[PDB]
Amino acid sequence: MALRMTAVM
Amino acid sequence: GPHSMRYFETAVSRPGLEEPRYISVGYVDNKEFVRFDSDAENPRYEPRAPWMEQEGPEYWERETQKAKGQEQWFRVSLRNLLGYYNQSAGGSHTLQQMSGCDLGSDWRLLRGYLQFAYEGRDYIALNEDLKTWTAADMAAQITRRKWEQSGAAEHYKAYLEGECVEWLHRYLKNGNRTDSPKAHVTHHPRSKGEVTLRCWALGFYPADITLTWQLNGEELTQDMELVETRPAGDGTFQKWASVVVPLGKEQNYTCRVYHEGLPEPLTLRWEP
Amino acid sequence: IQKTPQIQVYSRHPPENGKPNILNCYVTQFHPPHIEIQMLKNGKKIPKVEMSDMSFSKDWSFYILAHTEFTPTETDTYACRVKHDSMAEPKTVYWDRDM
């Protein structure tokens, strides 16, 4: 299961 | 032994394309096991090793909908970086990400990872403490401060120490080897002066290997020639290393092969 | 920054003249990932060339494996030609049964 990034760059 | 999970993600913009292409490749113990590609006719995460088809439909639907979310995350991030570096329209741009966890041979977490590159150069990474960020460029400080302000590293720490380990354990069970290299020496009549001996290692896995020629006890970079380890295409890898040694003094040169599947390194000489 | 592809051309199995085999074109260390790869026999495009899916290594560089069926002979020349934005010209590597 891949990590879920939250805040954009 | 130890174990690992990684996802390698890429978002690519090119001057013609409408929006970026997003690709996500997951690895377990350095072998690809799932892949999402926005360029597919129906984009979805898909199994890439037979043991992953054990996962039912709602696994794939859930993970697919997450990937569509990450695709939009990459789209916005690429647009933002364009401005951070004062890059105008009309170029090709690349965001890359690696993330995952390493497990000890006791199956406990050794280290978590979350690193990014822009244009193929380090952009920002989560430090081993899973609490603070490193960013080289002046442009990347903007992202660090945004991520510090929102406490983003806390969600990532929770993933790397929790779900990353927990799902890697699930995968390790559902997909529950090494191949030793076979080595031989070839003789290549080259010039009047000398010959080249080529020490071949074939059919091995994983790809990490080391070949060395020694003139009766001395390793030599004295124009020892090698190739980068390369895939045979069947799951196994190949490498060779070569050296020149005066005629009639062939069996005074001896090659050694180091690979992790071997009971001990192989020592071998040329054989007619 | 553009990184120029490195290329190996080699057979899956020890080559034996007249014996069917698999010819690989392994392309590494390039950036950005867009790349065009062709495999040739005596200068003619080999029709059925399989192409691995794009992947990258922990140093961020991309790699791809092209391969095709072939039966080596003593006289036939096999080649891999790569076009990439880091290079003004296409780069060709020729198969050498000893390497």
Q: Which among B19, B56, B10, B50 is positioned nearest to B34, based on CA atoms?
A: B50
Provide the shortest C-alpha distance from residue A9 to chain B (in Å). Answer: 5
Asked if residues B242 and B227 have their Cβ atoms less than 8 Å apart, the reply is no
Counting the structural domains of chain C, the total is 1
Q: What is the DSSP letter of B82?
A: H
Q: Do B163 and A1 touch (CB under 8 A)?
A: yes
Q: How was this structure determined?
A: X-ray
Q: How many CB atoms lie within 10 A of CB B128?
A: 11
B186 with B246, same domain: the answer is yes
Task: Report which residue type is found at C54.
Answer: M
Interface test with C, best of B95, B228, B237, B239 (most C CBs within 10 A): B228
Chains touching chain A, criterion 3+ CB pairs below 8 Å: B
Tell me which residue range forms the domain holding C7: 1-99
B166 with B185, same domain: the answer is no
Give how far the C-alpha of residue B74 lies from the chain's centroid of Cα atoms, to the nearest Å: 21
Interface test with C, best of B45, B123, B199, B227 (most C CBs within 10 A): B227
Counting the structural domains of chain B, the total is 2
Chains touching chain C, criterion 3+ CB pairs below 8 Å: B
B162 with B217, same domain: the answer is no
User: Residue C33 and residue C52: Cα distance in Å, rounded?
Assistant: 13
Residue B121: CATH number of its domain = 3.30.500.10
B145 with B236, same domain: the answer is no
B48 with B170, same domain: the answer is yes
Q: Is B108 left (phi over 0), alpha (psi -120 to 50) or beta?
A: beta
Q: Which among C13, C2, C6, C4 is positioned nearest to C72, based on CA atoms?
A: C13
What's the token pair of residue C10? 């080699």
Data resolution in angstroms = 2.0
Q: Do B164 and A3 touch (CB under 8 A)?
A: yes
B72 with B158, same domain: the answer is yes
B109 with B244, same domain: the answer is no
> With an 8 Å Cβ cutoff, is B249 touching chain A?
no
B10 with B67, same domain: the answer is yes
B16 with B107, same domain: the answer is yes
Torsion of CA B24, B28, B33, B35, to 10 degrees: 0
Q: Do B76 and A3 touch (CB under 8 A)?
A: no
Tell me which residue range forms the domain holding B260: 178-268
Provide the shortest C-alpha distance from residue B152 to chain C (in Å). Answer: 23
> With an 8 Å Cβ cutoff, is B146 touching chain A?
yes
Residue with tokens 């049964």: C97
What is the full DSSP assignment across B127-182? Answer: -TTSS-EE--STTHHHHHHHHHHHTHHHHHHHHHHTHHHHHHHHHHHHT---BPPE
Please identify among residues 1-9 of chain A the ones whose CB lies closer than 8 Å to any CB of chain B.
1-9
Which residue among B9, B76, B164 places its CB closest to the CB of A8? B76
Residue B234: CATH number of its domain = 2.60.40.10
What's the token pair of residue B171? 């995968």
Query: How many inter-chain contacts (B to C, CB under 8 Å) are there?
Result: 66
Provide the shortest C-alpha distance from residue B182 to chain A (in Å). Answer: 36
Identify all chain B residues contacting C13, using CB atoms and an 8 Å cutoff: 232
Where is the domain boundary, B177, B207, B234?
Answer: B177
B37 with B152, same domain: the answer is yes
Where is the domain boundary, B158, B177, B196?
Answer: B177
Asked if residues C8 and B228 have their Cβ atoms less than 8 Å apart, the reply is yes
A–C contact: 3+ Cβ pairs < 8 A: no
**β-bridge mates for residue A5, sequence order:** none
Q: What is the DSSP letter of B41?
A: S
Identify all chain B residues contacting C60, using CB atoms and an 8 Å cutoff: 96, 117, 120-121
B19 with B105, same domain: the answer is yes
Residue C62: CATH number of its domain = 2.60.40.10
Q: Is B144 left (phi over 0), alpha (psi -120 to 50) or beta?
A: alpha
Give how far the C-alpha of residue B145 lies from the chain's centroid of Cα atoms, to the nearest Å: 29
B135 with B188, same domain: the answer is no
Where is the domain boundary, B113, B146, B177?
Answer: B177
